[PDB]
Design a protein around this ligand. Structure first.
Ligand SMILES: NC(=O)c1ccc[n+]([C@@H]2O[C@H](COP(=O)([O-])OP(=O)(O)OC[C@H]3O[C@@H](n4cnc5c(N)ncnc54)[C@H](O)[C@@H]3O)[C@@H](O)[C@H]2O)c1
Ligand SMILES: NC(=O)c1ccc[n+]([C@@H]2O[C@H](COP(=O)([O-])OP(=O)(O)OC[C@H]3O[C@@H](n4cnc5c(N)ncnc54)[C@H](O)[C@@H]3O)[C@@H](O)[C@H]2O)c1
Ligand SMILES: [Zn+2]
Ligand SMILES: [Zn+2]
Ligand SMILES: [Zn+2]
Ligand SMILES: [Zn+2]
Lengths: 378, 378
């Protein structure tokens, strides 16, 4: 019985940028005050993990245990902790919800700044140290989650308690991309029935935007991708027209405006490319169009447009985790999935194990691939 | 009895860019269908007139009669014209409100397509000719208004009918600057009581934004200007803290964030400088801050920022004419003025004559100067 004991389990450790992860045995310390030790059963991976693994993230610290999309079962809790207990089923969230800071109390945002000083630098608040080590040397946390491990320790403010019957190998996606996309539509844009939408980038996130728009009652849901094969998959998620920029000499924004007789009501950029972010704004209708940036740009990249774009009534916005409050609304999204009102399973194209995590990274560049879910027991 | 006749009157004609305007006798033809001939009693001027006068519009048409801020008395109307008639007091508006086009009928904007194809090239829709000439040579209209004249002829969808007791030498402001600033607050931003606002540029528009904000209930109303003398006047309009960027080594956005422990709830750019437009966005509070580009604005120049600013909850917007519908709401603004609910008189620092228009141009650059109002009878 592990309560209060150091635990030795496997984890995928990243020692150097752009090099294979190696699966080590590691020591997972027990939870201190406010902390929650989780048996992670299933973890997914996405672009966000690779951005840091590739060495391109100037916040990156090595060595570290990456991973932020997971679902598991609480092993133990540190003192103070009351919203979860041993044996609860949980999804660790990269976005806290402390319910006590300026941000949480504001009623005007899902951002919460409670633990970010510590999680941004790969440690815990309580002692500003890591809970992970190999052979007496610390390994840094990542995103407050570190889910490429059979056990992790997270802050209690980042733990969403979910329906204990929910399949852990599916609801792991509800910690990142799917709520981002759904919520970009439902919370950030607030897309009304009959709206026309354009969606730039038809990966997991974009496809979730499309499901969101479809569920909210959108009419034209126009997808844009540099890989035309992406469209056939995308039709199931609700994309009903499609444009590859490469098939046109004109800037993609002008194509979209032409196609819609003025622009779309809402656009969403789900890639991370600043040029395309500009295009997604400039394809919105004069008077009232709104563009939402979902994509995360590289360090130092800038968006631009001409101020008349905004003066003539377009609005430029962006979204962080779909504007969802993690601890409060991730359980709600689990309920909706249990009730067959949102999709999750359809975003999973590979099921592998943690042993094969390097494969899973390569699959990040297969055009046909979406999420890979990893079973941490092997 | 001047109905039906060409009128000969004084007007200030711009023959080519940058040269002093010439006060000539010109001929003003009678109104044709859908048109209204107005006896302009008072006209002001702003940057928008100077923009074309100085040649800063590579497309500007010469010779022309400029002016777009004015008030007067209808002398006659053409066929089919019902909403005004001779003797009505009116404000000609550069923003049309036809009530019948795609944009007017959307409810989601104030910007009307209707008559732009003629006004945009200095002519009237009915016969695609100008109603002005000198010795038989055509003189182009400007912005559909051409108010630098004792008489002008405009389209009926550009004419607001107002309280006949309102002083014409005051309400001539309510067709441009003052509504743009007030509406920026009340319509575009929808500022709530208790909000903290930053206002960049304390000329007429910025001062109008300040009154807007005071009237709406804002708490901190922070004015930013490069000329520290402007604060004294701004206090009466509601500005209650002041920063001059020249007094600080750090960029102004960082000064304002420090000053407000995270940023303002709303900022307004009232200058036309894309670099300050960026600063206004970047001094908004994480999570919910909104920045309004107040004013057209501007030319060629791009605005930029890092998309993280929007991902983390800031919103970028802009406004033309403060979101007001010209024909319906300029008479409402005149009502508020007559009931002492908005200021107008305080924006006027000079009363000159049409004879002295070139002096009024020079005053556009005088620091202690706000609006100049020109009496057209001299
Ligand atoms: N804001 C948030 O909170 C949040 C949360 C999760 C992920 N994200 C971001 O969303 C983005 C998408 O992640 P994903 O997992 O769907 O990625 P993905 O790699 O599965 O999909 C990206 C898609 O964009 C397409 N694409 C690439 N360049 C393009 C272009 N120039 N024009 C059109 N399409 C183009 C690719 O063909 C691919 O279909 C990433 O930036 C990620 O960082 C944001
Ligand atoms: N529909 C519309 O959006 C609309 C209507 C009317 C006017 N406008 C625009 O709004 C603007 C204002 O006209 P105005 O009549 O108030 O002009 P104004 O010249 O009276 O005022 C501009 C002010 O900005 C200040 N300023 C200049 N550079 C600055 C900087 N770098 N930092 C801080 N302050 C600075 C100047 O000192 C001055 O007080 C103009 O751009 C005009 O083009 C737009
Ligand atoms: Zn992710
Ligand atoms: Zn919080
Ligand atoms: Zn003006
Ligand atoms: Zn119209």
């Amino acid at each position: 019985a592990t309560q209060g004991q150091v635990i030795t389990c496997k984890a995928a450790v990243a020692y150097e940028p752009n090099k294979p992860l190696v699966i080590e045995d590691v020591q997972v310390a027990p939870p201190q005050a406010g902390e929650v030790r989780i048996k992670i059963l299933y973890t997914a991976l996405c672009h966000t993990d690779a951005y840091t693994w590739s060495g391109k993230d100037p916040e990156g610290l090595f060595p570290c245990i990456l991973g932020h999309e997971a679902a598991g079962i609480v092993e133990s809790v540190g003192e103070g902790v009351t919203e979860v207990q041993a044996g609860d089923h949980v999804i660790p969230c990269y976005q806290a919800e402390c319910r006590e800071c300026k941000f949480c109390k504001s009623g005007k945002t899902n951002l919460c700044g409670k633990v970010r000083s510590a999680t941004g630098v790969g440690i815990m608040m309580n002692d500003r140290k890591s809970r992970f080590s190999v052979n007496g040397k610390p390994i840094y946390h990542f995103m407050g989650t570190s889910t490429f491990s059979q056990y992790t320790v997270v802050h209690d403010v980042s733990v969403a308690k979910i329906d204990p019957t929910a399949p852990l190998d599916k609801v792991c996606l509800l910690g990142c991309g799917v709520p981002t996309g759904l919520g970009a539509v439902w919370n950030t844009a607030k897309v009304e029935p009959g709206s026309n939408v354009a969606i730039f980038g038809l990966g997991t996130v974009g496809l979730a935007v499309a499901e969101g728009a479809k569920t909210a009652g959108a009419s034209r849901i126009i997808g844009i991708d540099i890989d035309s094969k992406k469209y056939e998959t995308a039709k199931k998620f609700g994309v009903n027209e499609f444009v590859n920029p490469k098939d046109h000499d004109k800037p993609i924004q002008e194509v979209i405006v032409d196609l819609t007789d003025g622009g779309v009501d809402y656009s969403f950029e789900c890639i991370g490319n600043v040029s395309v972010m500009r295009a997604a704004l400039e394809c919105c209708h004069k008077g009232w169009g709104t563009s939402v940036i979902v994509g995360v740009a590289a360090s130092g990249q800038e968006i631009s447009t001409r101020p008349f774009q905004l003066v003539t009534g377009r609005v430029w916005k962006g979204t962080a985790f779909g504007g969802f409050k993690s601890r409060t609304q991730v359980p709600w999204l689990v309920e909706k999935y249990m009730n067959k009102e949102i999709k999750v399973d359809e975003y999973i194209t590979h099921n592998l194990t943690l042993g094969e995590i390097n494969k899973a990274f390569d699959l990040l560049h297969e055009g046909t691939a979406l999420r890979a879910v990893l079973d941490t027991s092997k």
